[PDB]
Ligand binder design. Structure first.
Ligand SMILES: CCCCNC(=O)[C@H](C)C[C@H](O)[C@H](Cc1ccccc1)NC(=O)[C@@H]1CCC[C@H](C(C)(C)NC(C)=O)C1
Length: 373
């Protein structure tokens, strides 16, 4: 019954999507951010200025202390805590219960966001990148092994308050339109894929495709923006600045720091070009592309003066650790993390809240060489 999982996600724009879960006995309810960019399941287990509530191990009879510490650093933010196991369930998900590893966060820095509504994080990636090491089985692996839930999940993240769906164990045909296109997972650690071509405003970036995946390209629901390697980021911004030459924006805008407003309903979408990302396909020399609209990479933010002007932020930033296809990229699509077949599927999302596209086939030679080594 995937229908019961539809809309099981929510959150605030730019602060991630979270799902409700329960841990321990009796069940303790908490909101957990869905992160395909990590592999650790962790929850606040101690007081914190931004935590509405937290996991109380003492109150759980099924709690088991592993007597081992843990530290996890992200692109932004970090925490440390005590490892242990307990019973976990997902109210608006599969009707099952499993014992999984849980990191009880005792201390953190720039991790919890003031007013996010979530008190934990669910790393959905592979054990390979779990801390302290790959012997700490990730939550999804425990779920699949302890239950009959198929080895895959799908995410439908809807743009701007924000909502979405995490279908655990399968694909929900009502969450997308058109056909699903699959790209191979290059290696099972992060959900790594290979970008074989990039176009902006219909113009090819004419860069060595390896630059697009330096030093890797991952799909991360836990990162809001689209992050690009330095050299690719510079070329993208240049192309995007030109296409919107009709207008001028502060340098802070192009840094994702500042924000630009406009009269409610007067946002000049026509001046902002679409971005096409071509991904390695499933048959020889075959690829496909997903198109990202400005309505995606221009994240809407709170009005400065008063509710009357639509303000936005450039949701594209620079990266020194490879390409990151974040939420703004995932918003336009229904994304299938097909672990069982080591592939990720993309299809036009059913959530309207204009539209992005997924088209193929296209031809590209030596696709594997686009991957960085
Ligand atoms: C240990 C081996 C795995 C490490 N993996 C990572 O660091 C990945 C690449 C990034 C994480 O998904 C992280 C998860 C996170 C979510 C919310 C808050 C903090 C961390 N998000 C990031 O590091 C992003 C870095 C850019 C800014 C965003 C922001 C703070 C704005 N939060 C969201 C949800 O976008 C977070």
């Amino acid at each position: 019954s995937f229908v019961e999982m539809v809309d099981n996600l929510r959150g605030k724009s730019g602060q991630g999507y979270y799902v409700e879960m329960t841990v321990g006995s009796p069940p303790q309810t908490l909101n957990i951010l869905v992160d395909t960019g990590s592999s650790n399941f962790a929850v606040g287990a101690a007081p914190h200025p931004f935590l509405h509530r937290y996991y109380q191990r003492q109150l759980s009879s099924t709690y088991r202390d592993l007597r081992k510490g843990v530290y996890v650093p992200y692109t932004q933010g970090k925490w440390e805590g005590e490892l242990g196991t307990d019973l976990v369930s997902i109210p608006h998900g599969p009707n099952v219960t499993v014992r999984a590893n849980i990191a009880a966060i005792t201390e953190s820095d720039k991790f919890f966001i003031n007013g996010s509504n979530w008190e934990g994080i669910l790393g959905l990636a592979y054990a390979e990148i779990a801390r302290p090491d790959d012997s700490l089985e990730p939550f999804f692996d425990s779920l699949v092994k302890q239950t009959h839930v198929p080895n895959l999940f799908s995410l439908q993240l809807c743009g701007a308050s924000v909502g979405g769906s995490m279908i655990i164990g399968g694909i929900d045909h009502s969450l997308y339109t058109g056909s699903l296109w699959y790209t191979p997972i290059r290696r099972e650690w992060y959900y790594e894929v290979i970008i074989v071509r990039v176009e902006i405003n219909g113009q090819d970036l004419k860069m060595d495709c390896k630059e697009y995946n330096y030093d890797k390209s991952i799909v991360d629901s836990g990162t809001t923006n689209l992050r690009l390697p330095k050299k690719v980021f510079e070329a993208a911004v240049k192309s995007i600045k030109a296409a919107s030459s009709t207008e001028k924006f502060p340098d802070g805008f192009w840094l994702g720091e500042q924000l630009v407003c406009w009269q409610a309903g007067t946002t000049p979408w026509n001046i902002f070009p679409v971005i096409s990302l071509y991904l390695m396909g499933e048959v020889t020399n075959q690829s496909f592309r997903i198109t990202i609209l400005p309505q995606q990479y221009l994240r809407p933010v709170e009005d400065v003066a008063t509710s009357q002007d639509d303000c936005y932020k450039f949701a594209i930033s620079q990266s020194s650790t490879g390409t990151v296809m974040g939420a703004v990229i995932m918003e336009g699509f229904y994304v299938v993390f097909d672990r069982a077949r080591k592939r990720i599927g993309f299809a036009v999302s059913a959530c309207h809240v204009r539209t992005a596209a997924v088209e193929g086939p296209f031809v590209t030679l030596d696709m594997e060489d686009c991957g960085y080594n």
